[PDB]
Amino acid sequence: EVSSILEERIKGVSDEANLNETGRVLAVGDGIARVFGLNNIQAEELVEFSSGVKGMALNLEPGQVGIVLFGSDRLVKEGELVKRTGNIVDVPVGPGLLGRVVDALGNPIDGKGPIDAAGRSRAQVKAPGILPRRSVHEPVQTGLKAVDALVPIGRGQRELIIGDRQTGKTAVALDTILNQKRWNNGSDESKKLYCVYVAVGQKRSTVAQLVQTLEQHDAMKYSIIVAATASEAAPLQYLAPFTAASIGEWFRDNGKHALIVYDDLSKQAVAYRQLSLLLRRPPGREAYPGDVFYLHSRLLERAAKLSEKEGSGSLTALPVIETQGGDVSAYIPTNVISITDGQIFLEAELFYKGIRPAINVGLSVSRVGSAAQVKALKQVAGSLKLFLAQYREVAAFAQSDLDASTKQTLVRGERLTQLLKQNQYSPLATEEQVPLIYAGVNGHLDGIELSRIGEFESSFLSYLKSNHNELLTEIREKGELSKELLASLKSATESFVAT
Amino acid sequence: VRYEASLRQLEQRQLAKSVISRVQSELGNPKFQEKVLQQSISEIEQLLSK
Amino acid sequence: STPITGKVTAVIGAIVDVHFEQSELPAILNALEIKTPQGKLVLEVAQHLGENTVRTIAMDGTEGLVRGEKVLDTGGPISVPVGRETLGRIINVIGEPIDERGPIKSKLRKPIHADPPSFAEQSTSAEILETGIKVVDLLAPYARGGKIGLFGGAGVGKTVFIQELINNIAKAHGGFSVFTGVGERTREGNDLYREMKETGVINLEGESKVALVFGQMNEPPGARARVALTGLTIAEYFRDEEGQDVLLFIDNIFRFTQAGSEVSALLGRIPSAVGYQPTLATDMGLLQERITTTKKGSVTSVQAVYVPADDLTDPAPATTFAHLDATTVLSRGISELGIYPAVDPLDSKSRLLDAAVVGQEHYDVASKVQETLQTYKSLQDIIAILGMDELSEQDKLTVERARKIQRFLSQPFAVAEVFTGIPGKLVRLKDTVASFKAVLEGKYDNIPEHAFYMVGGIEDVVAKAEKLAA
Amino acid sequence: NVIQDLYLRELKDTKLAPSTLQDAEGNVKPWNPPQKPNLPELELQGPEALKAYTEQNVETAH
Amino acid sequence: AKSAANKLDWAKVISSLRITGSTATQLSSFKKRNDEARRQLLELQSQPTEVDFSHY
């Protein structure tokens, strides 16, 4: 019987613990048990209640230690013995969290059996030193043509993704992961990015959809989803990015590369606010704790491209901050903006105007740029940066009697903009990013009618595969366009454009 | 099929209250004396093993 | 009721502290009943302050509370009764009929607290609810088991929108519905009760396909806060045990926030931004998490939200905005233009609208609509200074289609026979896709603007043209 | 130990016995089978149709 | 059959041109299209008489 087996598991619990420090709750209100005892407690100790609830001890006051319950008050009551686990917070880190959805504790919320991990390591551990860190010579490709060229991203690099609420905020992040399937397949472990998605706030239904999408694209087989859902408690939410980072350290330390996407740190902030006000800890700007900055800075500097003495490895990061009204002035955005090296700022008007991704290039920046950009892609997109700049300015001069020069800009500009639009959940290879942009740059497609851009694009890709998938493979493998390749590429484009 | 499955769940909760009935039986029995004594000596042995 | 007897120590508000004796420990979230000529005053234990002195929140009024008044402890979360005669009666926070149709049949009782189902349990939505409201269907199609959210003005037909939904969707689907009112007016209550007796959804002899739990705003803040939790468990009884899908309806969840904000302050817990609860996020989150499409039963919430001073970036609407699958904004301006529904089409966005999901044609049509409206919106500014006098023939045609589309949206509702006196229209999903397609193609650019105004389907657009033509 | 005693006695000595088919039936849909495909009757009988159609038809141009 | 019905329907739009004053062309056309499509969606809606006894 199901009952007999369940009892058999309970029957095997009968060990007694001569608890060196025991405490007894004096009063528990607000999820802030104030416990009498626990003199040998180390700060941020994991403590196990009579209810079995786990906690941390943010306030160590002399007579009482105000434990913060990771659990719920429903199962907690006064007078309760509060056993001291006596070990500061640690989470399993190791290899086998690939394709595994876990909560912060490290318990699988997908419940795909016990976690495979090599150690449990503390999550309050610090960031790599200055000397233990060396430059980002590595690019990374998300499969989004604009992102990879206009805002080229690297590995061990942290760059913000600050944008309008859930307007494919999750979609932008997921796109990278899909192109990372290609790279993951790729043997080199600088190209085997073992991605970590940290779903903060996001409810279990929403994350279930994410999970389903990820399973559908088979992305789970390098993905890790640290999940702190809406139902999951605010201490768990608070420690969730810190915890996630620790998993990443194992990869980084192993010299491998990986990408951790904290989505959204804004909801992490709210949890810290909730905690602080309940612990009577000082509130601060925008009623967020004053040292919320200190948290974010610690977290985001752990991510980094290590020195080559440090086994040449990294933890790429791409934090996501959700701007509720595009308020970059907001305290949590301003802080993060300084810490981060780059921002991507999606604009709502563009979203409404059906540009999905709704990315606004003006307010998107990369501060590492061509160090982490493919040479081929750099060549054929310097022009693109300048062209788009003109198009933006001359977009507002689109409103009667207008010079031929202005009109040329408009034709080239509208067509380019249309070219950089991409349907959601379509990643691409760099070897196909380079041709399309080259064509647009040379204005072959700027000649082609706006309506016909889309059909041309797909046709061009097939045409390129037919005419010279040798060229495409060469572009992929050489990575640097020779004058001969640019000649040959131009010829192919010309041939295609004529049809 | 739905109530058939439900009856199984209802049975687990029925058997839960039957466990509670058995808890009262244990506490009625001089298992209350004898197994408490068993716990006492076991705790002595445990505490000696410290 | 455990012989834990407490004597009140402080009446300072709804917050009433009770002083249970030594050697007798209470537990958080218990239910205390205090014998009173107010029956049993129910106190939900919400903190322990130790020394067997609790700080509890009152549900009912605290007027005439005698100092040191004996407080029995009934323990655990208040357990209402559930059954299938829950359907067709109005039920107060503490689980008692307000329509006085006698006590609800207590086959089972359940606590008002319940915990969200686990990540593993969740089964994801992927079906399309139909509302029969064309704008809603095209530009924000709803999905069964969804979490629809009716952000909108001051009962600006917020109730009307819901009334239409009940008329169409609720009646149509065999599953139960639960209409829950958090801090709503007894005037509105009487209208809704009467109205739903009339529409027969409430059958006072024979089962109703709706249940009601009306909590009204005269009630102390504590009762206003914890009416919602009660409602959720009723839905759970249906969802789980009866297996039946629930088209839940709740009103108004800003009132849920406000009720909670007040008792945060009263509990002494420092209130966060714009005076909301410190635990605002998690309380919303727990409520939202409980509501989900479960394998046992798919629950489709329609949650009214009142956008205070029409500012939805205020933290309380903005926080809720995340948890809602299918947001909808109902704006005064569109109502004022004479367009019923009052929905702001750009701002109303449902998660599902993805190209394959709604079908390529539906998507393409909707993309064209979105562009047409967005173009029109851009051109409104141009018309403002320049005038429409130097903006293209094409632009003029796009604008003309937009005015026509604008008044194509004007579709009457049966539940605005009460208001306008114009019987509503239900337009098939396929028909709506077709009707919008035609307009965009310019097939109906010979049809008068007023022959789109306040009409339903394609047949109607043509027919009102014929009426004017005559 | 205590676990063993409570459980052993409970499982062994107390077992629920399944309820009546009627109780199961009560909580589930009972079943009654739908009847008829739909048999309509012959229409437009006799020369009523013949006369009506011949005379009615003049829906031509002149 | 069904293909005859629709082919003749569009033919009748241009036949009715030759003898304008149609008013039961619309009744013929509406009825044949309707019931053809209605029976087709009825037939596509169909779950033939089947019940589980394998699984359930």
Short mmCIF file of C-alpha atoms in Angstrom, two decimals, chain C residues 85 108 119 127 178 209 222 231 244 262 265 280 323 327 344 361 417 433 454 465 470:
data_model
loop_
_atom_site.label_atom_id
_atom_site.label_comp_id
_atom_site.label_asym_id
_atom_site.label_seq_id
_atom_site.Cartn_x
_atom_site.Cartn_y
_atom_site.Cartn_z
CA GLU C 85 -25.92 24.66 -2.78
CA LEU C 108 -17.87 19.42 3.43
CA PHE C 119 5.05 23.58 -10.17
CA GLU C 127 -7.09 26.88 -25.59
CA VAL C 178 -18.18 32.14 -8.75
CA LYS C 209 -24.54 27.97 -12.58
CA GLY C 222 -10.01 42.61 7.97
CA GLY C 231 -13.78 32.46 -2.48
CA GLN C 244 -15.65 21.18 -12.99
CA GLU C 262 -5.06 49.19 5.96
CA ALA C 265 -0.72 49.75 8.95
CA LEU C 280 2.01 43.31 -1.06
CA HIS C 323 0.55 38.10 -12.48
CA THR C 327 -4.59 42.15 -19.30
CA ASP C 344 -8.43 50.81 -25.15
CA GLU C 361 -4.66 34.88 -40.99
CA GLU C 417 -30.06 47.54 -23.17
CA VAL C 433 -11.60 37.60 -38.61
CA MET C 454 -23.05 50.27 -33.10
CA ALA C 465 -25.56 50.44 -44.78
CA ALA C 470 -32.85 53.38 -48.08
#
